[model samples]
Target: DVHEIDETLEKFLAENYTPERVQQLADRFQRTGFVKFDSHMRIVPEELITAVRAEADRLVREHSVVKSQDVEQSDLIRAVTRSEVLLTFLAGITRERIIPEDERYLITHQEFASDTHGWHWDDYSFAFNWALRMPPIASGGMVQAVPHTHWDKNAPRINETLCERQIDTYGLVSGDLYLLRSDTTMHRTVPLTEDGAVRTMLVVSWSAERDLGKVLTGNDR
Candidate 1:
């Protein structure tokens, strides 16, 4: 079944996709941790939403029950299987075709509530944004890459030189995709505009091999 699905996706990409198109998509993705892709193929069907909603509801109910049991807020209900399925489905959709066959994809999904603060830097891998849902007057829009981090601790500087270089070469808002590939690049987000508006997005990370060495250790080296 997995092979069949893969074959179908491959056919669809071959018929309607190009390397240039993927590159352009990646470009817009770099800007604000968001990317909008043509959904002619409907990678996220209605069923997926229904599933997520049902799972979220279950999580809420379970959380309520655990709260009554004197569980700590940090130890409240968890969505084990549901989260796993959603993540698996996301990884399947946003895979990077240019990467080696032996590589693995890592995906993350988050719902950012109002007043959330975010700072940014390169993720050291290509990031694909599958979706972004924002409410009216949302202030937390994405910011372009600037420069701020390194291996050796030093006073951070906003690398205006690199920022200007990227802007000049790539042009601004290159089709809504934002990408940050270099370390030391700086970026940040504005606070959400309204009180209840929530921002939702999916990001996928690609890497060669499983990189199990870094899994438990947390240090890549």
Candidate 2:
């Protein structure tokens, strides 16, 4: 099964991320600090998502804000995090070398009603967020982000930033994947507003060439 998952990712990467396609995506990412791969495009193999979901039931730990270390290890997530195919895809988007995160910020699982990954900037450069399940758009759990913005740890000034900058809100459905420029893009997940509604996501972290070997902190310290 592990071999199959690896092969699936390799095949998908080869077929979809051609030179021209990568260039087009890179242009968009350069302009917006964000890019999305829709579920219908099948960016991630269904079997891989299925495996992660099955293990997530046992691995996820509930918290006001879920932490990477809080969730138990799952082999599939780890393998994908370190997979060359993923790194290659990330490099194509940013046109910079990609480094897998250290233990502290490798993977995170967020699943709950009224769950909110509050507005914040990542210490690292990039984050690939995959939504496996989502409530209806009206129920919330959408992504709201301000690209090309800076984060001041001492002051934050979140309100001022929101008022002054252009905020882009994305209604992500199940199986959707989004890449965010975590370090520069101020982003957050909206709370699941409806009772009994839940939103689940698997986030994989990576560092850009410029951020490599530097000590960083913001949200995942």
Candidate 3:
């Protein structure tokens, strides 16, 4: 069952995420709209990641998008998705309740040099993304985000936001996990620019207290 992973994950959070550090992470998240952590070596452990990665590979088809239904088939994924330990720690960082998302939004996107996950704001309030695979920085698998921005689904001023705000660029290596302020943070992954380069990431959305029961029209499909 999920007991093994759940227990270890709980222990990892308890040992590393002290109250003081949670506060610091929250402050930084509030300031920059993201917090990056190393899940492989520190949190999840390499052995667990290998199993998780193998599960992902089995479920992952070559299709660019793998939706919730397809992903739910993996036992390890189910454990990770509904992990109480994860939600509690995220709640500590957000300083509010963190609700597990409905299955509809869970997904994995694989992007190649010619195709990328374009710029847009998520419909949800927050998201946790795991970097399963990423090409070298020079190959262009980087994230560019404009924090403290709002998205008007009908009249999203993308160019305006790009021109007027500070864009933060981040390069994520495999086994990195990041918490993102999705709704108010305009973000996207840069396209890989070299032959045979690819970037793959798994994302799980969550609801904040203020967004409970609210319907959101998504910006990007």
Candidate 4:
């Protein structure tokens, strides 16, 4: 099935690949993830965006509502896999240039079936999510990462503080996206409508080269 899809994609590339096509593809991808395509790079086609979005949606429903205080847990692997493809494409485009290699990009698929009630952070990192499917009545919230003298040294302390603050300041709506930039910004979800609604989004990140390498090695310090 994947091979067939790949074949079809190759044919599409051979026929209708252009700048307009790339923009269309990028716009579509942005709806599913926070992808920053290099100004001169155009590796993904519009068709691939459709396919990835479909796969992402399916995976989200299948893996909906994983326990993630910090980023959306559902489709974590799928997000990684999908992002890898995009990163690979970026690499191909920048092969001739001295592209800085790092895990700057991160992806997550999240669903709020019920109320989030609290907030959390992905340790010391930046995060973004692309909305896929959100209920008309559903609402979303934000997560803040506070800076501390030893913020990077203590996860539990930061988590406890972040969660407490999140519950205190609630009011997020469906289809809304958030970005966790620093450790000091407080965030929380807005209450959902009376009707039960499911929220869906793709969470992604971009890590600096040094940080990316350290994370891979399990070295946060």
Best by TM-score: 3
**What is the C-alpha local distance difference test score of each model?**
0.36, 0.75, 0.77, 0.40
Please identify model 4 stretches exceeding 4 Å from their true place.
1-50, 66-114, 136-191, 213-221
Which candidate leads the pack in lDDT? Answer: 3
RMSD values, in order shown = 9.1, 3.4, 3.3, 9.3
Model 3 per-residue lDDT tens digits across residues 1-221: 45777788888778776788889889988999988876432545567667766777666764467777777777787787668877876778788888775554355555555657789998778888878878888888788888999888789989988999989998888878788999899999887787677566878788876566565532233
Model 4 alpha-carbon miss at residue 163, Å: 13
> Which tens-of-lDDT digit does each residue in 1-221 have in candidate 4?
34344444445444645556655554533332223322132234444445555655555445534233222333433443345444443323222111223233332434434455344434433444444444443244333233321343445464566545423231233333333332223333443443446555455544444455566898754
**TM-score (C-alpha) between model 2 and the true structure:** 0.86
The pairs that clash in candidate 2 are none
Question: Which run of 10 residues does model 4 get worst, by summed lDDT?
Answer: 91-100
- Candidate 1 structure quality by residue, lDDT tens digits, 1-221: 22243444445445665666655554544443333442343333333334433433443444412222221121111221113332333333334332212112221222344444344454344443323343443344444444333323243434534445442122221112233333344444445555555443323333322333345477655
Better of 1 and 4 by lDDT: 4
